[model samples]
Target: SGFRKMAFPSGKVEGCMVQVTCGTTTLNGLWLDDVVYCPRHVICTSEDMLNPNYEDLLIRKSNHNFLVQAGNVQLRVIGHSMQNCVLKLKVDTANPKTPKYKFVRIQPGQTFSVLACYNGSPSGVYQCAMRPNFTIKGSFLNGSCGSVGFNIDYDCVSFCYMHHMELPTGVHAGTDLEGNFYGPFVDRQTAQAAGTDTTITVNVLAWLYAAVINGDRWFLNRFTTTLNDFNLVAMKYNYEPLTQDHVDILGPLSAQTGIAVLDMCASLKELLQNGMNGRTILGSALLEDEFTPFDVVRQCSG
Candidate 1:
């Protein structure tokens, strides 16, 4: 949304107006108009979303993750928290293909197993996490994070290509952490000497402490709320991509509602992966528990 200017009386700038921005264009030219005092019936921000603009980004129920490096990767699926869940293999990085294998209705917390297709698997460099929906995450998983990462690279090594280019001009043009990773923000010669996007080391660090002050168990309920708010703020500024790590941890322990949320997020990820936008993707997706009724089916068919 666009921002508007407010004219305050001469020498009366104490309680006038402040700038506010929302992602949509509707807010472009809004302000206190010519009023000397702030109006009471104006729209204010929700302490959470500045006032709940949209639903939070959904989380996938991918309870288990695989990080492959080399060798025959052994995935010993222990069905503790997960009972009657299924397991499947997905090589998403390589061209899209049906899963190579799937284990169905494996007893929860049981040690079910699957093998990797060693040949043409590119040393399993590309990782694919199997979930319930047997589509996004496992069919039975939720959008929360509490699973584990199976390090499949414990026995292999490989190589790839490289290139070196000059940096660009921006605010983060320095050798700092953000700069080193996403810079040079500005076109400083010193910044160029520091590092480039490809040069920085990649590490999967945990979420922010502020986002989880009391740890996973203590903060699961409010984690989604806080992260969504942070994400909306980021959207206003074009800073960073928001994540669902907070939801991932919470969903597992919260309730079945968490599972339902994961199902949606997983489905969302699939639609996105297929290059579908929000409107087209989710337009006809809302449905009830069993199959559509006869009337509904006929209407859709027609």
Candidate 2:
């Protein structure tokens, strides 16, 4: 007799090796957990599976699902030429028996309801699948099946978002691609209550810049240093990145620099025109506002 691994409700594979019998042969098979993730298994697909690693697919998420927490997750999908969208939730492994949540038809330029909660058992590598017209469409972000994983602990809440981009300035280009953006405190109320303006600004900027630069470990360590320097504390137990739309939440400051880089440069140029020495002019301007790593990085690069 061959042993078939039971798929537990906790969503974990019980054994490493799996055995199945097929027509006078004892078939040896590896458990799904040890198997490589493929598009077919993650999303509902009728056509030949597309390479999940590819990023240029038009079906990918326009607005991603962020705000992951224990027992609940919230996200929105931008439907591009799709209707009667179904969102399928899964734990570690994709299952044919998984339930799919139906939503009103979605179209481009329209976003999903905010803070929509999909309740589930706490703990596991949580992922959601997008299905349009009852076929697996795509994922919100990157990973096999275009999936993103969130390792949330029991009884805790965490925000999951990623920030990687290049600005007009030539110096900074996707500097913090490797860092995690998701963390605790989804709003300013908690953040402001926990730390001072300088401390909060420093922590947020440190996290942001570390995402922009190339030095992975160095930048992350510097983030910790910035936290300590300002007597601030990181909210999440883990170093997951915040995936929230910073512009939606932080407004103009979301530019990475509190003010636009071009604007800052123009102000500096104007200061120099007034006959003030370069060093004094720059220092004086920096002292006038809450300083952030963005200013330092931009000034140094200039």
Model 1 lDDT tens row, 1-302: 11111111111111111221122111111011121111110122234322222212111222133221112322222221211111122322231211122112221111111111111121111122211111111211111111111111122211000001123332111111111212222211233333211100000011111112222222123212244554454344332333564345333222422323333333323322343333321122321111111111222223
The most accurate candidate by lDDT is 2
> TM-score for every candidate vs. truth?
0.18, 0.17
Which runs in model 2 stand beyond 4 Å of their true positions?
1-85, 89-143, 151-154, 157-204, 207-302
Cα lDDT computed for each candidate against the true fold: 0.20, 0.23
**How accurate locally is residue 197 in candidate 1, as Cα lDDT from 0 to 100?**
18
Q: Score candidate 1 by lDDT.
A: 0.20
Report the C-alpha displacement of residue 234, candidate 1, in angstroms.
Answer: 1.9
lDDT for position 145 in model 1 = 11
For model 2, residues 90-145, the per-residue Cα lDDT tens digits are 22332332222121322111111111111222213322211111111112221211
